[PDB]
Design a protein around this ligand. Structure first.
Ligand code: PSJ
Ligand code: PSJ
Ligand code: PSJ
Ligand code: PSJ
Ligand code: MN
Ligand code: MN
Ligand code: MN
Ligand code: MN
Ligand code: MN
Ligand code: MN
Ligand code: MN
Ligand code: MN
Lengths: 419, 428, 421, 421
């Protein structure tokens, strides 16, 4: 089934075919003059996939308010339908990231709906940062690192339940992000809290399938405003190293202190084999969770530069999980996810254009200016023609958002869904 | 009416009177050696008041979750009852700051309850950063600076109603904080958006009584994550200067960029007569809204040092409004507000101890070390005996939190009020 | 000609074919977007940014300085090097001088400038360091120093900068001082600012009718607790207090972490106090790195505000543009060349924004299409436009490549002795 | 004795009465709190922090240096000044040397220290600046430089620092380098780190059995885009990779804005890699200001983690403590005196925390009482304890007051030639 009529996609592609051909051939010639085969780039671009968050499909909110749009998805099933649109048009988001209990539903049915829509499932995400009605023990003061044994046990059990749901739908990993920390100095004993967390995570690791990975996600602050147990990549490394080979670190771009060189963290984790994956988004102040690349596109390019370099250096067994973790508070969630996915492919595409041989020589000779200009020659390249062509060739739209709007999908779901 | 039994307050004071006497006399002796009359300090401390937020007595939350405790207040009347407890035990929070429409209710009943509890009302707070039921225009894309004329008018009308409610209950000011801003470059035109805001505020200004003040509150970010119309004190000054004499700037401690020298902003606003008031709280990362002084007590003291210095050299009827703006997500709201009000008086008391004459000399001599040590000599002084004696002398408790727990108030209201349920904040 | 014309010719010819292909390709793409590439190029070749005299020599940190070969011996050598930057980029016809660093006979300075085809931008005073034979030290401040005689000495220095500037063609004085404190209590915030205001008022009195006085704010460094002119708020208060000739200068790296700098620019323009810019890039503090090397989009967003001002028809809006950078690990001339290029790049992209469409998306609160309208311009590779603008005006298609081909650095290295103490 | 004993005695007697009153009052308050003031004073008397040789001279920024009078020139003058701090505070018996700044015949250094009653803490290498005659420049790095010969030169310099240290009684080498990049792409993060690790392994081999090697992380400066040893995470990787003798040194002002530093301290202690501390305070960057002059509570919280660690009896816990500050606008000796004082103040308050009560409130999630339990200790004015500790150990009740009364600064000013006067 196709959420967006195929005739609309065809019509909107034909409407832009002429211009695209000119832009693509123009870029192809320019790249050839630079010794790059544009076909080789497009080929890799159409293979780059990033998972879409179920929680990004509906309108998000802040601690102050939530302003829903029309046709808000009623549950995980409506969310999957909307995710299908993103994948149909960008062809870059074949897998969906689920969050439990937000997306709790019959696993078998989730699998059926996913298969019918042509969608897969990425890492599962546990939730012990909020209480569910009728919950025996509250996570107000923590979960996996809570002082109360029963509360930790409950948190662990919930994570095991997430694993069970994931196994039913085809997921192969569990991402653990908790709000555990303190809001006041002295409230928590930093070391003891971390010891409890490590002990609890060891129990989850014990119940982790051998064809699964366990991802721990660090965050400097929020919901905890004084200290957070898994506060940065340093603590995260200690966790992954301590737990085992199947445990790795997940880097969410917006979870770092102001001015942090995030691309270096990525490099460090790769070198020591603990870079499990990414949670893509952009920010300017805190964990803003804005559309990827909308604030600092160069930074996004530099992160991918490290990923591509890893391959170039011959790093092996390197297959980071890529996921978008965003909240869309003032835009059509589907549109933002579409352009965010496009932006991630944009950064990846530019990273592929870096002349590694040239860069290597400038680094060795300490020619900083030419080294940075070598990175810029790649970043400054407008790879949109490649992104559009990759989409067109794989059943997607030349201009996803334009086709999305031309289809009238939002008004359609608005009529189908309550207000 | 006494929310907390007088016998309990008396009992809990007698239990600690002996130790207090010793500490107070020791401190009095130390201050005397320093040429300071402990009695003069206590006399001023007894008269220092800071407004408590009504939204502060209820458990707060984050965008990820809210964990309500037992006996959560149902509405403004329950909240007023709880604020009465903070005032009775600390004697430092006689006025409550209301937020509309969270606390909307009959002005006669509000004023009636306040009077019976011995509570007054500080500045009113308007809410155009959220949508209420039946609202004709959404504030999703802004309010006073929204591109839609009808929306701006609706926001203006709401503020005018806030002034109306405040006039009926004895309030003398309106504080305006909005989330207006953008999450993406290009979404808003910085200039046009600010021009729209100024024009809307002008209409609100026209509705201000002659003895009222309009406080605009800046904030770097949240809920807007790319730009905010009233992002800092610079824009805030432009606003106040543009609107008029009754318009001044409100400084919320946790609303500044990382590493900002906040005490300097206070000085600058005072110098140009635009320091409307304060929103006290503490933080480490963003607008954490934590208990005042719990993270950086020295910074709080330094802010009060600017306030006391201005006071010491008599300036333009200088009387900024002091208010606490905090959310308590992991403690008993009443206890945190009690100790936060205490910390504010603590910083004030310490600022009073600064030898202004000596500091002035060291500043003119460019003796940086002695100048900073002059400040530290005051700050390092443990003024707790003063704070406790000030409380004891005015009908308060020597140890407020201790007295609060001994009274069993929380267990009491928990039994009278419906049980609560945890859930999310507005993440989805 | 600092750089041989035959070299510039040879290097341009070697790249003419590729430029033609890229420019014409870009031209067609722009035409399809309703934009005339010729109109963009015509404006780009006229965008100028002043080159800092202090940026031509290698810079350093409080830890060390690593000079390269052929470091300029004085201001005259610096002007010679600035001539290279202008000849190759054609985007830096004016130089910004710093007194006393560049103190010399005004007549000679002017003669060298005219000979090289260079002009002079705003003068820069220096009361953040002590010069020989000074009666009072600026250790504890200058224009805001508690000692009246020290403030007077600083005022006199600024007036002298104005006299030098008048003689050489300058029409503005930029004032940046380190005045502030490293400890709470060391300074009375208000009295220190009042002293500063009194001093600046005197300097203002020495301003010719057609001159401007620019005060430059900075959050910290050299002062590490408080700085008198710490941010744009205090800066606005200064400009408004002083008068019509007093305006604010914004140095990109002088703001608190995460500050929305483009908004400050918009605010100052709205109230007519945006005197000019000090361009550079940074990641941590006032790093003074090559413009656009760290955050190119932010640079573009700043220019988006500058172009919007013209779009909105702001009157008498002629901000001064100056590069304020230090080059610690690269050939200063090469960094200044590419930095000037980056600035023209951000400017050109700002010119490509479809303001009509943008205006529509803003009014309809279509945040996604509004930001995409900005991105469509920013994502455009305008390098061909920059290169064509240079070709037409006597510059180099690839400035740094041409600079390296000329062997200029090696030449001046043999002419200039390295300082030994 | 640098300071006349009669002056110390006279200034102590002058303030003995008030001290007795305050100490006794504090003793009674603590008594009521179940604490023996005598036990606290006894521990404070034994808390020592290394004074940096580079701390007694006036510091500066990249913009300027404003030397005071009697500036110490060379290590011998510096040791004489350091002796004044130790004599008056009795809290800084050991000095931290920096090579080559303090290079001199080891025998003479040892002799001079013994004569002044001063020992030597960790040695400090310097490959972040170039020395005269140096074969290879550290402009683009040192231990992680791409040029093999440059790395070898840096390794040898470090080995030389160990040799000097062994001769004077030092038992550790602290390695802080500016290695990094100012531009994206300039360095390959991983390869640069691999080169550093290989270089440090060589240095590690020259370590005696009883020596420690400390690596000090820093977010930025002098490198403004990336730094090889940028944070504690990379620092942990280094220490763990090198071996048991390698540990991490934490300099308070070397972290990103808002970083929870006390947590990093706890984490390093838990994994046995907390080598030591570099004390100072800051507000913006690596300001290197007097310890506790900006954020005294943060300093207390760091000591809370240290005192707790001992309370828990953690293994591998025995951190070195050193002051690493620069004094740009004060008498360096007075600042080091009051900084050492602040450090003992924070230590003393940490000793007052009721660990049993705290533990209870932590287990019961009573956040308010847990934090108040810390505040009850922090709010306590321990100055009487600090003053008494000094008085009882040969120091001054009021160090700075005694220092000024002695007229020391004027004395050395008359013995040492200033650049101009
Ligand atoms: O980033 C995170 C919270 O800050 C986690 O990944 C969450 O699970 C995700 O954002 C959904 O709330
Ligand atoms: O600080 C504020 C929001 O950040 C405003 O004062 C609010 O009105 C107050 O905090 C209540 O949410
Ligand atoms: O930016 C500044 C100092 O931070 C001023 O403009 C200086 O005068 C300039 O950078 C030269 O040092
Ligand atoms: O802190 C450091 C430099 O930032 C190192 O410890 C230095 O060796 C010390 O500060 C002396 O410059
Ligand atoms: Mn995430
Ligand atoms: Mn997040
Ligand atoms: Mn507030
Ligand atoms: Mn707030
Ligand atoms: Mn500048
Ligand atoms: Mn600067
Ligand atoms: Mn250090
Ligand atoms: Mn340092």
């Amino acid at each position: 089934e196709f959420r967006i009529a195929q005739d609309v996609v065809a019509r909107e592609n034909d409407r832009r075919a002429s211009a695209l051909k000119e832009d693509y051939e123009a870029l192809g010639a320019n790249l050839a003059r630079r010794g790059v085969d544009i076909e080789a780039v497009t080929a890799k671009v159409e293979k780059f996939f990033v998972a879409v968050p179920s929680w990004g499909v509906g309108t998000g909110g802040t601690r102050f308010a939530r302003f829903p749009g029309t046709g808000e998805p009623r549950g995980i099933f409506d969310k999957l339908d909307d995710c299908a649109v993103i994948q149909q048009l960008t062809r870059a988001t074949p897998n969906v990231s689920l969050h439990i209990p937000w997306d709790k539903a019959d696993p078998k049915e989730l699998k059926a709906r996913g298969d019918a829509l042509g969608l897969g499932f990425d890492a599962m995400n546990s939730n012990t940062f909020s209480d569910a009605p009728g919950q025996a023990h509250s996570y107000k003061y923590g979960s996996l690192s809570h002082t109360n044994a029963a509360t930790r046990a409950q948190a662990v059990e919930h994570n095991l339940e997430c694993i069970e749901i994931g196994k039913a739908i085809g997921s192969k990993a569990l991402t653990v992000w908790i709000g555990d920390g303190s809001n006041f100095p002295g409230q928590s004993n930093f070391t003891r809290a971390f010891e409890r967390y490590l002990s609890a995570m060891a129990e989850i690791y014990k119940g982790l399938p051998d064809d699964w990975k366990l991802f721990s996600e660090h965050k400097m602050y929020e919901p905890a405003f004084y200290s957070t147990v898994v506060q940065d990549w340093g603590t995260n490394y200690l966790i992954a190293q301590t737990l085992g080979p199947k445990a790795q670190c997940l880097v969410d771009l917006g979870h770092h202190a102001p001015n942090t060189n995030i691309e270096m963290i990525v490099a460090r984790l790769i070198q020591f084999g603990k870079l499990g994956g990414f949670h893509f988004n952009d920010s300017k102040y805190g964990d803003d969770d804005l559309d990827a690349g909308a604030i600092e596109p160069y930074r996004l390019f530099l992160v991918f530069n490290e990923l591509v370099d890893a391959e170039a250096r011959g790093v092996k067994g390197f297959h980071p999980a890529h996921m978008i973790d965003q909240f869309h508070n003032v835009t059509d969630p589907i549109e933002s996810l579409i352009n965010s996915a496009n932006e991630i492919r944009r950064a990846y595409a530019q990273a592929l254009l870096v002349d590694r041989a040239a860069l290597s020589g400038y680094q060795e000779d300490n020619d900083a200016l030419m080294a940075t200009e070598t990175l810029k020659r790649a970043y400054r390249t407008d790879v949109e023609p490649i992104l559009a062509e990759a989409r067109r060739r794989t059943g997607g739209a030349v201009d996803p958002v334009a086709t999305y709007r031309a289809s009238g999908y939002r008004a359609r779901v608005a009529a189908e869904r309550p207000a």
